[PDB]
Amino acid sequence: PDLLV
Amino acid sequence: REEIFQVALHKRDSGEQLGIKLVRRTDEPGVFILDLLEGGLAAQDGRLSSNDRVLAINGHDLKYGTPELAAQIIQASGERVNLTIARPGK
């Protein structure tokens, strides 16, 4: 739902 | 989204992270940059900023996307990651 890419 | 532009980041290695924290807002559709990771790829470029909307990554439509889809497009991409951003006004 909330990633570090 | 008062300004639309492209920013292309260049991964120094195949598995390099862009250093972008992608989050979704509960009040509107889209994928948004919450913050840039200190010293990361995107932060060193400096073109990107918090509150930017990621409209597309490498031509892949992220208008109604999710941060997980964005991560999968970046994982599938080569060294050039071409982000299309919609920066709000003031």
Residue numbers in the entry:
A (entry chain C): 118 to 122
B (entry chain A): 334 to 423
Give excerpts from the publication.
The C-terminus of the severe acute respiratory syndrome coronavirus 2 (SARS-CoV-2) protein E contains a PBM (PDZ-binding motif) targeting PDZ (PSD-95/Dlg/ZO-1) domains, which is identical to the PBM of SARS-CoV. Targeting multiple cellular PDZ (PSD-95/Dlg/ZO-1)-containing proteins through short linear PDZ-binding motifs (PBMs) is a common strategy used by viruses to facilitate their viral replication and dissemination to new hosts.
LNX2 acts as a molecular scaffold for Numb family proteins, essential players in the regulation of cell adhesion and polarity. The crystal structure of LNX2-PDZ2 in complex with SARS-CoV-2-E-PBM was solved at a resolution of 3.3 Å. Each of the two LNX2-PDZs present in the asymmetric unit are bound to the peptide. In both cases, the last three residues of the SARS-CoV-2-E-PBM peptide bind to the canonical α2 helix/β2 strand groove in each PDZ unit. The proton amide of Val 0 also forms an H-bond with the carbonyl of Ile 353. In one of the two complexes, an ionic bond is formed between the carboxylate of Val at position -3 of the PBM and the amine group of Arg 357 at the end of the β2 strand.
